[PDB]
Amino acid sequence: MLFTSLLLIIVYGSLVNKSHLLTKLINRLGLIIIIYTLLIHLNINTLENLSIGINMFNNLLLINSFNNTIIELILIICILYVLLISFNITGLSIIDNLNYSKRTFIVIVLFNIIGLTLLPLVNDIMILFIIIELQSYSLYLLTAIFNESHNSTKSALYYFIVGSIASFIILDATVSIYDDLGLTNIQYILMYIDKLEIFDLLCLLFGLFIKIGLAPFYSYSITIYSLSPTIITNYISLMPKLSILTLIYIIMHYINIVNNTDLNYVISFLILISMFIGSFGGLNVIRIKTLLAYSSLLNVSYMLLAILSNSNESIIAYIYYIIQYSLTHINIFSIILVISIYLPIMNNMLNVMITKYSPIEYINQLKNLFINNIFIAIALCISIFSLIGIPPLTGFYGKYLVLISGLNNGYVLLSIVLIIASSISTVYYATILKVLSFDTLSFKDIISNNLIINTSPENNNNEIKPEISNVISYVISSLTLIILLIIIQYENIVKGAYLVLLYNWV
Amino acid sequence: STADLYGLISFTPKRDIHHYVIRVDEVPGKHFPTNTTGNFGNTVDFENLEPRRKPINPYL
Amino acid sequence: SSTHTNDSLNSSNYVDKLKDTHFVFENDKLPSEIPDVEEVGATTAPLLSAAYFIGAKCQDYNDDFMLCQKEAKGNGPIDCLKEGRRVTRCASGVLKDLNTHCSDEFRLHWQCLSFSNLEYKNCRKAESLLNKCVFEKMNLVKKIPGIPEDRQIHLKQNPVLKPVALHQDSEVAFKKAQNENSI
Amino acid sequence: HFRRLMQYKKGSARPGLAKYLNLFSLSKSQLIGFPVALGAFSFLSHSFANLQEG
Amino acid sequence: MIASLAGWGLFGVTVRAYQQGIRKVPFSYYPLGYVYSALGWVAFGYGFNLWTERNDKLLEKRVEKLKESRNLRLS
Amino acid sequence: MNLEILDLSILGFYSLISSNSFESIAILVATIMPVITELWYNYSQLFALLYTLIYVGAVVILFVFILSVINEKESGLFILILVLLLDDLDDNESNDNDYNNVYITDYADWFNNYNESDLSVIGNLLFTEYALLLLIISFILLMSIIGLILIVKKD
Amino acid sequence: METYELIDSDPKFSRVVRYFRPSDYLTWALGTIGAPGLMVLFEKIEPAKGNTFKMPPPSIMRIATTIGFFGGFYYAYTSSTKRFWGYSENAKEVAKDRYEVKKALSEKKSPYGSSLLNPYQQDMSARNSTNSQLLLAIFPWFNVANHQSHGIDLRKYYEVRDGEENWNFTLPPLDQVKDLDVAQYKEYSNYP
Amino acid sequence: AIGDYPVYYKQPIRWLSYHAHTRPHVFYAIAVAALGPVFMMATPLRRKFLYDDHEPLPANGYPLPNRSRDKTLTGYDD
Amino acid sequence: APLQQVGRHGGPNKCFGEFQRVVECMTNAKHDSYEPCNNLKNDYLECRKHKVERYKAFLMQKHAEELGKDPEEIGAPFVRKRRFLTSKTLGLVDGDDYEIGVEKI
Numbered sequence A: 001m002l003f004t005s006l007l008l009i010i011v012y013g014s015l016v017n018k019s020h021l022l023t024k025l026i027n028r029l030g031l032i033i034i035i036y037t038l039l040i041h042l043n044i045n046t047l048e049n050l051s052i053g054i055n056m057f058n059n060l061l062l063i064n065s066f067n068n069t070i071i072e073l074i075l076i077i078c079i080l081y082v083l084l085i086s087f088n089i090t091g092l093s094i095i096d097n098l099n100y101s102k103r104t105f106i107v108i109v110l111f112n113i114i115g116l117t118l119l120p121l122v123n124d125i126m127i128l129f130i131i132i133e134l135q136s137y138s139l140y141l142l143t144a145i146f147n148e149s150h151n152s153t154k155s156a157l158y159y160f161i162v163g164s165i166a167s168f169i170i171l172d173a174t175v176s177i178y179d180d181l182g183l184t185n186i187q188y189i190l191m192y193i194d195k196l197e198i199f200d201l202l203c204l205l206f207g208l209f210i211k212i213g214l215a216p217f218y219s220y221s222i223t224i225y226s227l228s229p230t231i232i233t234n235y236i237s238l239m240p241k242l243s244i245l246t247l248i249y250i251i252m253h254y255i256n257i258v259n260n261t262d263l264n265y266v267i268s269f270l271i272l273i274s275m276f277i278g279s280f281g282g283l284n285v286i287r288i289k290t291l292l293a294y295s296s297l298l299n300v301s302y303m304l305l306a307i308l309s310n311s312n313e314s315i316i317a318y319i320y321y322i323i324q325y326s327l328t329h330i331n332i333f334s335i336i337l338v339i340s341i342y343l344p345i346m347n348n349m350l351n352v353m354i355t356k357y358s359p360i361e362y363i364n365q366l367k368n369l370f371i372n373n374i375f376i377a378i379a380l381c382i383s384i385f386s387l388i389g390i391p392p393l394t395g396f397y398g399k400y401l402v403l404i405s406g407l408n409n410g411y412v413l414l415s416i417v418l419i420i421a422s423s424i425s426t427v428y429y430a431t432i433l434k435v436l437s438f439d440t441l442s443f444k445d446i447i448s449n450n451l452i453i454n455t456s457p458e459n460n461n462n463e464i465k466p467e468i469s470n471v472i473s474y475v476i477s478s479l480t481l482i483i484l485l486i487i488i489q490y491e492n493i494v495k496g497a498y499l500v501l502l503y504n505w506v
Numbered sequence B: 001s002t003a004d005l006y007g008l009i010s011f012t013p014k015r016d017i018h019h020y021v022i023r024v025d026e027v028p029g030k031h032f033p034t035n036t037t038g039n040f041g042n043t044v045d046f047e048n049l050e051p052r053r054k055p056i057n058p059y060l
Numbered sequence C: 001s002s003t004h005t006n007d008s009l010n011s012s013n014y015v016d017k018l019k020d021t022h023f024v025f026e027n028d029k030l031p032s033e034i035p036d037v038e039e040v041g042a043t044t045a046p047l048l049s050a051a052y053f054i055g056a057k058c059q060d061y062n063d064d065f066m067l068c069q070k071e072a073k074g075n076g077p078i079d080c081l082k083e084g085r086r087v088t089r090c091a092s093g094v095l096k097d098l099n100t101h102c103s104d105e106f107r108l109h110w111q112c113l114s115f116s117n118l119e120y121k122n123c124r125k126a127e128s129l130l131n132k133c134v135f136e137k138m139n140l141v142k143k144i145p146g147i148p149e150d151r152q153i154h155l156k157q158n159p160v161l162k163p164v165a166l167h168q169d170s171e172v173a174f175k176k177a178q179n180e181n182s183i
Numbered sequence D: 001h002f003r004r005l006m007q008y009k010k011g012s013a014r015p016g017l018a019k020y021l022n023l024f025s026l027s028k029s030q031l032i033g034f035p036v037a038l039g040a041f042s043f044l045s046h047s048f049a050n051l052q053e054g
Numbered sequence E: 001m002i003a004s005l006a007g008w009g010l011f012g013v014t015v016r017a018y019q020q021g022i023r024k025v026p027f028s029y030y031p032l033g034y035v036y037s038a039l040g041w042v043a044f045g046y047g048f049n050l051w052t053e054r055n056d057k058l059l060e061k062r063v064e065k066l067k068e069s070r071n072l073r074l075s
Numbered sequence F: 001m002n003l004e005i006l007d008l009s010i011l012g013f014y015s016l017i018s019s020n021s022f023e024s025i026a027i028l029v030a031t032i033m034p035v036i037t038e039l040w041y042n043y044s045q046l047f048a049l050l051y052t053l054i055y056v057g058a059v060v061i062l063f064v065f066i067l068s069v070i071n072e073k074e075s076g077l078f079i080l081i082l083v084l085l086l087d088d089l090d091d092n093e094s095n096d097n098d099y100n101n102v103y104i105t106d107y108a109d110w111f112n113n114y115n116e117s118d119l120s121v122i123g124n125l126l127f128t129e130y131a132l133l134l135l136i137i138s139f140i141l142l143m144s145i146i147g148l149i150l151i152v153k154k155d
Numbered sequence G: 001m002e003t004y005e006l007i008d009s010d011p012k013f014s015r016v017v018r019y020f021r022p023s024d025y026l027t028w029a030l031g032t033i034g035a036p037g038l039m040v041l042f043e044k045i046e047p048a049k050g051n052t053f054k055m056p057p058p059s060i061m062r063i064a065t066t067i068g069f070f071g072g073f074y075y076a077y078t079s080s081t082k083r084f085w086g087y088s089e090n091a092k093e094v095a096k097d098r099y100e101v102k103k104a105l106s107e108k109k110s111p112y113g114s115s116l117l118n119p120y121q122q123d124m125s126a127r128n129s130t131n132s133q134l135l136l137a138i139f140p141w142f143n144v145a146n147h148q149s150h151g152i153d154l155r156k157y158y159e160v161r162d163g164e165e166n167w168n169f170t171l172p173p174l175d176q177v178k179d180l181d182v183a184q185y186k187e188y189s190n191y192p
Numbered sequence H: 001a002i003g004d005y006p007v008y009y010k011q012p013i014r015w016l017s018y019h020a021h022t023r024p025h026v027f028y029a030i031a032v033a034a035l036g037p038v039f040m041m042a043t044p045l046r047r048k049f050l051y052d053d054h055e056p057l058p059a060n061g062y063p064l065p066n067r068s069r070d071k072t073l074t075g076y077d078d
Numbered sequence I: 001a002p003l004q005q006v007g008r009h010g011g012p013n014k015c016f017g018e019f020q021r022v023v024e025c026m027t028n029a030k031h032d033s034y035e036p037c038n039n040l041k042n043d044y045l046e047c048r049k050h051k052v053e054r055y056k057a058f059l060m061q062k063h064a065e066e067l068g069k070d071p072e073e074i075g076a077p078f079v080r081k082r083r084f085l086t087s088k089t090l091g092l093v094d095g096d097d098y099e100i101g102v103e104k105i
Ligand SMILES: CCCCCCCCCCCCCCCCCC(=O)OC[C@H](COP(=O)(O)OCCN)OC(=O)CCCCCCCCCCCCCCCCC
Pocket: A215, A216, A272, A273, A276, A277, A417, D022, D023, D024, D025, D026, D027
């Protein structure tokens, strides 16, 4: 349904006249295609039947209940992202018309969802390399979709080079595996899981570690995320980790058969180093996207401890964490795409150049959001409080579940560092909350009419004029209450994760 | 009861190079694109093939 | 197919230099416990000429030699040494017969094969004479399994693909039989 | 160090290349101090392991 | 079971009520909005309870096998 | 006199000293040619010709095509030979000594009366066994056609 | 675990369409008219430009109907497939399937149909299209070949169940059924 | 409509004529290409009216008789 | 299951038989563990690289060195240039030692 509709959108888009209304309407055709895909997927795919694991397409693709969880999650998060490009994020024509200037935006996104959803299912080194390129090529194109922008093109060039080296490392590990065994199917390799150099699978992981931005490779991800348009950074900083971390978990599932300790020490060396950089790095930053880039690295460090431990509680910790972290990430970026309407306008010093690609770029552009919109400020406060790990939000249960998996497997050193690194990172999450509210009472009664939102035309002066569009507001509210009120249905959700199996059985 | 149920689910059986799940349901090489009978090294017979190890569905 | 291998002669001496190929002999003959057989001495062209008469005469032994390979279950070379000598003796029997019954008809045909790139399509005039001679003096016939008798290729009166150049000894011998035999 | 010296010779006027090469450069003391410390670290770590019987 | 969908619907009313504040509009604006947001989450709430009841049936059967395995371990 | 060593030493000498982009594109052509020639002899003649048809004929002349577009603007003999000599000493890619000093053969057999080229088998499997790999590739090619036009086309 | 009888592990494409229930056609119809409606519903939710409802141009509604025409069929195709695999209610199809196969064996024809594909091509085709409906939400792939790896035992079509003996079908031994693996390798053991 | 561009779903016949006059480089490339798959569909017609498909080649190795080894096989012995 | 180790002619190659015997043992249902198949796994790796057999050749080379056995009398005769596979070397009755024709077949 995804592939067939993609061809129809490719042909149709190249026929009709270049205009914003038609570009925005085609973006609403893709929102249907992704919705239709989820209905067909959930219809045939069930947890109860995919438990054993089912080979598809001459064993090239293997699907089980652990992979199947993430495909539905990926489809869901791709619906919430397409809602941004398909509806108004602000309603001001100047800021919004950027999302509709490109007709191939939705096509490239639909290309990536095919790439993302097939990566966890791969079961052959021949198709592992092909699928990882299909996902990797789609990201470079999306990073350069705004080809007029100098920073966007400079980022895609940086992205392509780093990913090309990353893909070469992945390709070289598979070749080395084929050299030793002569087999391509992953199941056939499992028969020789004790007879092959287990470090050649680690060389495979080193390639997948680059693509998720893990230190010492973290440098490029921070640069890329702080240069792309905020609508682009909202996608490329979350989606690759959804499908690669699922793949990394499976590869580590096979690896722990021989339980090689040297493999675990090197990965612990990278997890430990990344927590240090992910925490101390964000202390001295001014750009919000650079801040969320360091925040992303720290959460990936937590999620690797659940992957590295790889027990029965590690499935629960990973499955829960990857879901709550995606909703938190969408909620935060959606707010940053909206609160740009409250920016002031000059009528000077420090010569800060703002562009239509990142209207909100600095942390102090969040100033006085407690005054301009109190309800959305709390939503950003609740979201940041989840990242801090304050209970009983979603973020606490992610760290609590990760700690169970980590300590149950003897990772005492990493468990303590993650709890040190969490507190160090609380400093720079607290700065976002300091900027949001702390200067409320001095600014309470101010004469503000130079905001960007004050350039909106007055329609009637009799009817009520809401400040924020309908769809984006409903998404922000829904994900803010889900983050806040997870305590109500937490027991059902966690018991719904006990059933996700990866060859546990009995 | 909750402490009992969690103790059952959280437990992870030990896996070594002796017991682990391999998802191959059949022996390849019954038919080849050409020259199916090579040096006759295919000692495996498919007429009297022993039953394979079928997977366990813990929800059935 | 001219792919390089590690089992026979390759394309050029530059392949040998890269691989550092040594062409190794083994003087040791077979042990006396295995009774000796007289190996077939025919070259490529005579064998391709008499291939269908070896198939007609040694059909039972060839099938039995192969069935020993199928049921040896990987130990084929060692457990079919006795059944592999019947085939060698049977095939030597046919080539010895053609040399003592149809020496000129046989030689004419495989000289044609050595003249026309070892292709059966180019030597039908010589081949038809050899088949007719073999039938009367040894009762062997050429049959291609899997098709009706009326639709065998070598009996095709007007073939679509014909030799570009004629074999003089074939055309001369053919028209002589058009007088000796087609009375 | 010698390998990074060859990269210095190839490109010197370029600002970005010397920007990154300077970060990795080790002072003449560090090129001597670092190997001694690790050699001292490995000797003292192993030696104290035998004294403690573990 | 209606009370379970009652709670889910009341969560639907809260989201629409929380949407008004973000948009900065009076909480009585467009009263049909609260019905649509309520019914949307009752549809979600209806399915969510189906999913959890399905989990109970699956988890009871899996635990039947896990108890047997523990007894073999505890021998 | 395995002269394939001398071709790469010259190649390894010019890779250390190349300055402009003309020489950088020359290192590419000077590397494929030893790759093609060492594949023509020894291992695989089919993939020597596929490399020439696909790399030289398709992706190499694209480099020089864009170099004319991009721009054309703008060490010591002791260190180079010292580095090249040091690079020259240790050339054993693997440390299985017996695997590198002991020769092997294969035994041929006559069981394969349907002899056809490798490209016959590769097509036999790519268009039947792994038809998903073939179909994804045409999908990756399709995305590039869209991907090139969105990146480069102005309006 | 709702398990039923496994009619066919790899149901053929023409069979899956011929087994649509009336409700399956309804889903195909609903999917066809749902996609154009979803475009209208979004405009009612929020106009694309301006602040007031404006019907989307007819060209978008035609491409929307096509996209929902395949999506509706794909949902219909997968739902019909679950019955064959046994994941869903298949009692109605089991009798319908048994009637066709018992009739087919009776005429000495193969239940699976004659095939242009050789033995390797038949088995290779089965590998590609078996369990391929699980990713039918991503890209399409259908079993359009008359192969023989359907995951059933043809012995189970000999025994008579309730309400079947009245059909009075005569079933020969499988060794005499045309185009079956148990009836082909009579001359050579590697050629059918 | 003396020269208007035809609408395909209202004037199918005239729509092709517009493209068979103004775009001969597209119309006949599609017309030639479709004649291949069309001819493939008419293969069953040829089977029932012209001639059957040939027998498949013996490209599976040596044809092994489907039986047990002969027990009375003699001759050509040592 | 997917085909692995396909020869250059479409049939099973040298080491396919060993790999197939491994799959039969691993996917068998009468095995409690994977211990019985451990020897079959070695044979498949052995068939491909001959590492153990090359090692055995190394000792027989090294043992003869420590005993003084003459390599030319323990080893097998060989020819390095294909043009000098002459009929004198091949053992033909009246064969010359003149080189053979390996120009064009
Ligand atoms: C052998 C080649 C040289 C060494 C390369 C080491 C590679 C591995 C490093 C992993 C992290 C990659 C860091 C990025 C590359 C850094 C390269 C570098 O050294 O640049 C120098 C930089 C500071 O440069 P600067 O000293 O100001 O200028 C020198 C003037 N000549 O110095 C730095 O910024 C380096 C510090 C970066 C952060 C590293 C800290 C990692 C955390 C380790 C402590 C963990 C503590 C956890 C507690 C429990 C465990 C004890």
